[PDB]
Design a binder for these strands. Structure first.
Length: 109
RNA sequence: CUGCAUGGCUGUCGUCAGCUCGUGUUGUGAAAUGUUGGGUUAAGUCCCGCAACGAGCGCAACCCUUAUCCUUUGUUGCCAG
């Protein structure tokens, strides 16, 4: 059991064959995801994430695709949150030894 | 005396636009990318666009000279009021 929203899809011939073990078939000329084989994955995700949050762990939200570049920063305003929504460019995490100076370099401005 | 032994100095290209690094990326690695591409120039310039983002030196401005004006000042020079 998992509730899922209404599907219409887009790009009727475009899919990645690395998703094959999680594709249920095709309906309305788009390939569709399996919403039963993914339930033990969703039921783990809500629990292992709440465990990191219960250890005060810093959760970083990502939405660089323009469809999500507002949703990532507009889903809450009564909570505190960390987000990235502009191009990663030289990188952020493997390049954190630069970002830790980029924030100081910004705060002087 | 030895620069075919050396710290350097000067000559060459040439005031040419280039040499190199931090971290990310590519490559088995020696190495590359960044520094390319597309507009535009004296110019790795100035922009746009990107697996790059910034940075040191050279480029360039600041700096020196001057056109026309403004402003201060002096002798045994100038002399209007």
């Amino acid at each position: 059991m998992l509730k899922a929203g209404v599907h219409f899809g887009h790009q009727t011939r475009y899919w990645n064959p690395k998703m094959k073990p999680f594709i249920f078939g095709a309906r309305n000329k788009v390939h569709i995801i399996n919403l039963e084989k993914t339930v033990p994955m969703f039921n783990e995700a809500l629990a292992e994430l709440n465990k990191i949050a219960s250890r005060k762990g810093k959760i970083l939200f990502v939405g660089t695709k323009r469809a999500a570049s507002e949703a990532v920063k507009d889903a809450a305003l009564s909570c505190d949150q960390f987000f990235v929504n502009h191009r990663w460019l030289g990188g952020m995490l493997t390049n954190w030894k630069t970002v830790r100076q980029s924030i100081k370099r910004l705060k002087d401005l």
